[PDB]
Design a protein around this ligand. Structure first.
Ligand code: D9J
Length: 138
């Protein structure tokens, strides 16, 4: 087991062809999960499954600059399930982060923070038991 919130350093920042894989299990009474790719205090890519936003399950994605959240990108496809194991894969492509959950493509998030090699940490938080968090080049 890995302790949550967990920080995964991304040495030298992200680059296209970098694949991040996260394995965990959603807790039974889950409310929220967050992945935060950070550039110092800024959040280049926030990926945030919400299990009960006005009785809806939604994934909210956004960027935080100078402590301000920007325009949200919302996805109603919701592949997480309370109490169940999951795999998140985040592939850095030249123009977007590409996310798959349990081997099925979920969404893409266009790069708003363009200094990719300054996105040096990934935070993992929320209502999960975290099994593994790693990266490799494809
Ligand atoms: C109801 C709600 N939620 C938000 C924020 O939405 C952001 C995405 O647009 C982020 O999701 C933001 N957020 C979530 C979390 C968070 C913290 C945690 F510790 C965990 Cl474990 C987690 F899963 C998420 N921290 N910040 C969350 O507070 N709102 C918001 C959205 C925008 Cl675009 C601007 C301002 C806000 C507000 F937070 F209200 F000020 N409104």
């Amino acid at each position: 087991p890995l302790i949550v919130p967990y920080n995964l350093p991304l040495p030298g920042g992200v680059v296209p062809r970098m694949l991040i894989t996260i394995l965990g299990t959603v807790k039974p009474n889950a409310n929220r999960i967050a992945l935060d790719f950070q550039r110092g205090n800024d959040v280049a890519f926030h990926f945030n499954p919400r299990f009960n936003e006005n009785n809806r399950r939604v994934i909210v994605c956004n960027t935080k600059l100078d402590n301000n959240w920007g325009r949200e990108e919302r996805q109603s496809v919701f592949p997480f399930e309370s109490g169940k194991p999951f795999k998140i894969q985040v592939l850095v492509e030249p123009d977007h982060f590409k996310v798959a959950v349990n081997d099925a493509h979920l969404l893409q998030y266009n790069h708003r923070v363009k200094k990719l090699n300054e996105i040096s940490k990934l935070g993992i938080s929320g209502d999960i038991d975290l099994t593994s968090a790693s990266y490799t080049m494809i």
